[PDB]
Design a protein around this ligand. Structure first.
Ligand SMILES: Cc1cnc(-c2ccccc2C(C)C)nc1NCc1ccc(-n2ccnn2)cc1
Ligand SMILES: [Zn+2]
Lengths: 285, 77, 586, 382
């Protein structure tokens, strides 16, 4: 009777991850109560689904088109944010959980003058192949110093000229949840890169931080995509319970529990997994 | 009028010359000229928000040295 | 690529630099100084103190920043490198360009010279280093214009500095690799890869025998290298900020350095403890030139980002408080246009320069209208505000510190303006078409005889430049030189079709239309952009004297009858849909 | 002729390689003709271009074939599918790199006949399971995902396509040349189709037909045949076969009796199921064909397990018209006509099952069943 779950596996994977995000359902019920006595449907529908899963999870413990997954998560978090800002006119669930701040630094190679931009971010989009690699290499391709030359020269306002420049990104403010959007797709013509990175269970972002910080991050949810093309496929999610310490493999209508070591080996690019990781979620320790 | 940055699929940064009045379809046409990716396949993320078709760069407060992020859709279901 | 037409609004003679100076060359025989300016002009100066006007000549053939110049062949030949991706050979005694080398694909930044072999190397941002023989280049003719190119290879990033020794047996390259690569120019073979710098290198030196190398980098350190041992034998941390210029004496024992920190030092190489602060400049130091007439050098010439070139005496270095406070000799410089605003008529520009003077310019006539002085630039923009909209038809770049106006096929003819709105006494006029005919007025191919567009004339000395969009300069000439024999053949080859249609074929560009549907205030129509409201008023009058009985409104605002729909759509409409006008009885 | 064409490509593929697009344009045009001789030559011009040219001209060959299948002409589609199957067999390695373009045909199944859908799933499945390298594992699981969502699609047309493809793939996975993990994968897929086709009777009938035709015309693994026999024999017995000791009960407006028996016994529960439709009885014949083929393969042509279904009675009413044909209502006559067809179809499939026996008393039972078919068919005319 639950063969229709697979038709919305993009939304199911996002909801499965959001369910186990520390404090997400704690914050949603707080907003639901506020909207309850105010008398918006997205918060109410979210609470009903969270209650429904709680009934299902308790029973499990006691009596044993096609859409992008990241895009759906973007719409859900964006709509939650707008409702929170409307409640202003607590209410910072999206800002505290998923929203951080980047400092983008440009250095002209002629005058050596520094210019900076401040931009918010909810996820970190990193490449998976250059054009065996690890996640640190991907963030280095994202945040380390890159030189823009040739057809991509920087226009310096100090020199009033097109000059070569160095661009570097730094993490100023860190959210509780770090989302890694993996560009497991390339262009010539669009194709899917089936070779994943070496995903680590521990992530330290001090290498690209404005200040030296001892805050480490631990992986707790992976959203994978199965298919040989980017136009269609299937989404699965593997979350971590914090049964605690085991990974839940949500596959349409079935749930599988595995050890942390077993799941890590399944993520190895050497074995050539069929499920290509697409979103990595890290929580602050 | 102003120059913005786009981080492409490989993480390499390119530059675009845009007006504050350009629509999102104009930026995507410029990105296709430099990257060869069809505009209907392009997703542009600025400051954690996806740029919606029909709006302009001034709607999103996109200024000089602002960085967009280019991704595609990994459809599933 | 698509060919663009650009021109510079300037005076016939630009005596002083209008931007910074990138390179310096000193001629000891004639006592002449060469300055490679950021305004794309090389100038010759007399370093004699008797002359109250040191200006001699201007060497104007480049179209972008001139990055390096070397004086070779006993001061008879000058080799120049520039941001327009060209290397050019000059007659330094007369001051005209003889030939242009187009082997580079990006900005050319560095030039190396070997006096004994008369060998010159050119390196740039395309990671290419090319070797040239000056005598072969100087002996080039129109018939014999072929040269065999010998290029060094192995550099994985853009070169910012280059060096050769006197004997022409060692060449060193500095780049953003943070390492130094050494070749043998005779055999074009790699020798070594010096490492230790942690940033880009912009200054390189070598001794006569070519076994010791001096390098300065953006990390703020000067490193002395030994080519025999392939190692850094000494490191000097003298400047607070990056090091951009280096100079050494004939004994190769004292190094003169300057950079972004604006301070110039004389450091003893055998022991770095003896450090003398020569001066503190008013701008970051780009290049320095030593006066090698006597030992020790009496003075040093300094080029900065400012348009002024100063000489500082070195009397008493070997005999913190700076050694000098005021420069001995000063070469005056002009002002650079740093800010630009195009007025609503798309014909006049207000500019602000480095002296805070505000000037009023006429793009169509390619001349300055009036000087305003130290007036507030933003207030002057509001003071000259007009209630009119003209489509954009030109682009402005201030890379050389001067007004360069660029005309591209996409929007060159997008601005149609009635003669009454302009200052010409109403026939309907295209500003882009009129300007192109004035720029190519002297071209015989445009004569059918009448000369030009018949309304205005750009100054005859206006430099007209043809180039590819984001590419190379196809052809450069003055406005008055189009009638020459050699220029006419070059114009036939380079002038693109979209300019031929208007200047030669005398065709008329398109007439753009806006569709607007009238609705009675409580039927789609398309017309010319310069159609006045009065014409729409009278059209309704026949549908139902016309001005007095009918009033038109848009977005709940009354419309000026003398105003046109182009202005209406841009200013009052404030919407993404088709223009809507409402007709109501007065 | 083919040998002349084969010799041309074999010894002069150096010169021909520089103009593969010219050859392919000629080949594509030749396939649009109406003569089999010209059509066969154009197919060979595709096959030889794929074999003797480089990687780029090979992708053009596959891309040209994909356009032929998505064209609309019946003859063009079947011929291009024949070339695709040939290219997979000769060069599976080169076709594994072109699987993305071959998979793209699944988006245009609306203009493809069910016969060509089965062939398209055959070339896709035989390509995915041709090798066991890591490249094949990606398409193997990708084909599984496409079918798992056609089976679960809301459209009935796509659900039937999923049944065809899943049975087609299961035949190639279970094809005898198989480890336990391979045997449980084909078992898992079959359970998925059986579960997804339970709701609709016509969709269920298609599953029984497709899976029976697979067993009859293909040789599967011995272990795979073991599981299918046990589940089909048990389910069919629990679905239709009932004990004759228990008399029928219900509100039937006609007397219910055991009819057409031969010579403590089992009987076919048919009339109550059809009246309850006012396992579906409409799938009684295709399901029994599946059961019979399963028992034959397990026991190597032996049918001692299902010997009781030949002589078992059938729960039927007094189907002889007792001068009440005019008085019969419109609903009753429609139910009466459907009653005859299902009983006739059941009798016809029994004759199919036991027509290969040798026992003299067995043959007389088959003859009696054949006589019943003739008698029932005459009664159907009334
Ligand atoms: C079959 C299934 C598929 N999706 C989800 C699900 C989960 C989170 C959020 C949203 C969803 C759905 C509604 C999209 N839940 C499922 N089943 C319930 C369940 C829950 C928890 C466990 N579990 C084991 C150990 N700790 N908790 C085991 C079973
Ligand atoms: Zn700069």
């Amino acid at each position: 009777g639950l063969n229709n779950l697979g038709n919305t596996s993009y939304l199911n994977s996002i909801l499965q991850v959001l369910y186990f995000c520390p404090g997400f359902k704690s914050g949603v019920k707080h907003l639901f109560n506020i909207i309850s006595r105010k008398k918006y449907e997205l918060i109410c529908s979210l609470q009903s689904l969270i209650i429904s899963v709680e009934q299902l999870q308790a029973s499990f413990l006691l009596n044993p088109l096609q859409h992008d997954a990241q895009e759906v998560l973007q719409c859900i978090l964006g709509n939650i944010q707008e409702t929170c800002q409307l409640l202003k006119k607590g209410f910072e669930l999206v800002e505290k959980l998923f929203q951080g701040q980047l400092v983008l630094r440009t250095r002209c190679l002629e005058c050596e003058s520094l210019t900076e931009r401040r931009e918010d971010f909810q996820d970190i989009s990193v490449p998976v192949q250059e054009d065996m690699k690890t996640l640190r290499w991907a963030i280095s391709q994202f945040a380390s110093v890159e030189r823009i030359v040739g057809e991509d020269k920087y226009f310096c306002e100090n020199c009033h000229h097109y000059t070569e420049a160095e661009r570097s990104l730094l993490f100023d403010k860190m959210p509780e949840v770090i989302t890694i959007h993996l560009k497991c797709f390339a262009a010539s013509g669009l194709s899917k890169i089936n070779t994943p990175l070496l995903t680590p269970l521990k992530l330290s972002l001090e290498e690209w931080s404005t200040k030296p910080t001892n805050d480490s991050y631990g992986l707790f949810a992976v959203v994978m995509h199965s298919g040989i093309t980017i136009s269609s496929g299937h989404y699965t999610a593997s979350v971590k319970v914090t049964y605690e310490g085991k990974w839940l493999l949500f596959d349409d209508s079935e749930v599988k529990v595995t050890e942390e070591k077993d799941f890590l080996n399944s993520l190895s690019p050497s074995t050539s997994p069929t499920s290509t990781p697409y979103l990595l979620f890290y929580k602050k320790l | 009028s102003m120059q913005i940055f786009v981080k492409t699929l490989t993480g390499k940064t390119i530059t675009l010359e845009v007006e504050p009045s350009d629509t999102i379809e104009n930026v995507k046409a410029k990105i296709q000229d430099k990257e060869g990716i069809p505009p209907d396949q392009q997703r542009l993320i600025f400051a954690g928000k996806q740029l919606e078709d029909g709006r302009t760069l001034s709607d999103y407060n996109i200024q000089k040295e602002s960085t967009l992020h280019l991704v595609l859709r990994l459809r599933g279901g | 690529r698509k060919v663009q037409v650009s021109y510079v609004i300037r005076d016939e003679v630009e005596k002083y630099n209008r931007n910074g100076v990138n390179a310096l060359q000193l001629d000891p025989a004639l006592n002449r100084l060469f300055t490679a300016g950021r305004d794309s002009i090389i100038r010759i100066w007399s370093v004699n103190q008797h002359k109250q006007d040191p200006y001699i000549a201007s060497m104007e053939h480049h179209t972008d920043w001139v990055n390096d110049i070397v004086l070779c062949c006993n001061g008879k030949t000058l080799i120049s490198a520039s941001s327009d991706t060209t290397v050019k050979v000059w007659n330094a005694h007369k001051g005209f360009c003889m030939s242009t080398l187009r082997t580079h694909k990006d900005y050319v930044k560095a030039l190396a010279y070997a006096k004994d072999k008369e060998l010159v190397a050119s390196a740039g941002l395309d990671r290419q280093i090319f070797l040239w023989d000056v005598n072969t280049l100087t002996a080039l003719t129109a018939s014999n214009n072929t040269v065999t190119t010998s290029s060094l290879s192995g550099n994985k990033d853009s070169i910012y500095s280059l060096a050769m020794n006197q004997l022409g047996t060692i060449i060193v390259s500095g780049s953003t690799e943070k390492v130094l690569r050494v070749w043998d120019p005779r055999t074009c073979a790699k020798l070594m890869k010096l490492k230790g710098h942690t940033d880009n290198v912009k200054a390189l030196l070598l001794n006569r025998d070519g076994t010791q190398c001096l390098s300065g980098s953006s990390d703020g350190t000067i490193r002395l290298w030994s080519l025999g041992q392939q190692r850094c034998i000494a490191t000097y941390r003298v400047h607070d900020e990056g090091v951009w210029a280096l100079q050494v004496n004939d004994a190769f024992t004292h190094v003169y350095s300057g950079g972004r920190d604006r301070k110039i030092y004389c450091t003893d190489l055998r022991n770095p403890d003896i450090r003398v602060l020569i001066c503190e400049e008013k701008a970051p130091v780009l290049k320095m030139e030593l006066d090698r007439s006597a030992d020790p050098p009496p003075a040093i010439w300094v080029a900065t980002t400012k348009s002024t070139v100063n000489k500082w005496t070195l009397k008493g270095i070997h005999n913190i408080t700076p050694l000098c406070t005021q420069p001995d000799q000063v070469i005056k410089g002009g002002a650079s246009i740093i800010q630009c605003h195009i007025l609503n008529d798309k014909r006049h520009i207000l500019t602000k320069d480095t002296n805070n003077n505000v000037a009023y310019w006429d793009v169509l006539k390619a001349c300055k209208v009036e000087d305003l002085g130290k007036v507030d630039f933003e207030d002057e923009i509001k003071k000259r505000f007009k209630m009119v909209y003209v489509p954009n038809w030109f682009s402005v770049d201030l890379k050389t510190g001067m007004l360069t106006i660029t005309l591209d096929e996409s929007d060159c003819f997008a601005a149609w303006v009635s003669a009454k709105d302009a200052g010409f006494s109403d026939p309907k006029l295209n500003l882009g078409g009129l300007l192109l005919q004035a720029l190519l007025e002297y071209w015989p191919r445009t004569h059918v005889v009448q000369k030009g567009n018949g309304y205005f004339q750009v100054p005859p000395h206006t430099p007209v430049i043809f180039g590819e969009a984001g590419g190379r300069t196809l052809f450069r000439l003055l406005c008055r030189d189009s009638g020459g024999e050699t220029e006419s053949m070059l114009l036939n080859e380079t002038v693109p079709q979209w300019v031929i249609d208007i200047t030669v074929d005398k065709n008329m560009p398109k007439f753009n239309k806006i569709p607007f549907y009238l609705q009675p205030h409580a039927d789609r129509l398309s017309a010319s952009d310069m159609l006045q409201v009065r014409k729409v008023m009278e059209h309704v009058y026949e549908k139902i004297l016309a001005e007095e009985k009918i009033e038109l409104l848009c977005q709940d605002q009354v419309l000026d009858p003398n105003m046109d729909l182009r202005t209406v759509k841009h200013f009052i409409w404030k919407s993404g849909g088709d223009l809507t006008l409402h007709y109501r009885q007065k | 002729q083919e040998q002349l064409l084969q010799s041309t490509f074999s010894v002069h593929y150096l010169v021909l390689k520089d103009m593969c697009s010219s050859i392919l344009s000629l080949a594509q045009s030749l396939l649009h003709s109406l003569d089999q001789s010209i059509i066969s030559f154009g197919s060979l011009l595709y096959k030889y271009a794929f074999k003797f040219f480089d990687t780029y001209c090979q992708q053009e060959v596959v891309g040209a074939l994909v356009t032929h299948i998505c064209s609309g002409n019946e003859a063009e589609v079947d011929t291009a599918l024949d070339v695709l199957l040939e290219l997979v067999v000769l060069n599976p390695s080169a076709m594994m790199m072109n699987a993305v373009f071959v998979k793209g045909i699944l988006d245009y199944l609306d203009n493809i006949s069910p016969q060509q859908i089965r062939k398209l799933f055959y070339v896709l499945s035989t390509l995915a399971f041709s090798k066991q390298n890591e490249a094949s594992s990606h398409i193997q699981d990708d084909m599984h995902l496409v079918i798992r969502k056609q089976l679960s699609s809301t459209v009935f047309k796509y659900k039937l396509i999923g049944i065809i493809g899943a049975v087609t793939m299961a035949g190639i996975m279970a094809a005898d040349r198989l480890s336990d993990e391979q045997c449980t994968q084909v078992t898992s897929l079959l359970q998925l189709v059986h579960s997804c086709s339970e709701q609709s009777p016509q969709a269920s009938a298609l599953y029984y037909d497709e899976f029976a035709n697979l067993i009859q015309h293909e040789k599967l693994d011995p272990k795979a045949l073991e599981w299918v026999g046990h589940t089909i024999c048990n389910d069919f017995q629990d679905a239709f076969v009932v004990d004759s000791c228990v008399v029928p009960e219900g509100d039937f407006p006609f007397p219910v009796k055991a009819l057409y028996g031969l010579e403590d016994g089992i009987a076919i529960n048919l009339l109550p199921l059809l009246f309850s439709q006012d396992v579906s009885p409409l799938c009684l014949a295709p399901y029994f064909r599946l059961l019979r083929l399963c028992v034959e393969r397990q026991h190597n042509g032996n049918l001692e397990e299902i010997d009781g279904l030949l002589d078992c009675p059938i729960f039927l009413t007094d189907l002889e018209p007792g001068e009440k044909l005019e008085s019969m209502s419109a609903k009753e006559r429609s139910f009466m006509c459907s009653l005859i067809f299902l009983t006739l179809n059941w009798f016809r499939e029994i004759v199919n099952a036991f027509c290969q026996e040798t026992s003299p008393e067995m043959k007389g039972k088959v003859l009696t069943r054949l006589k019943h078919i003739v008698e029932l068919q005459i009664i159907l005319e009334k």
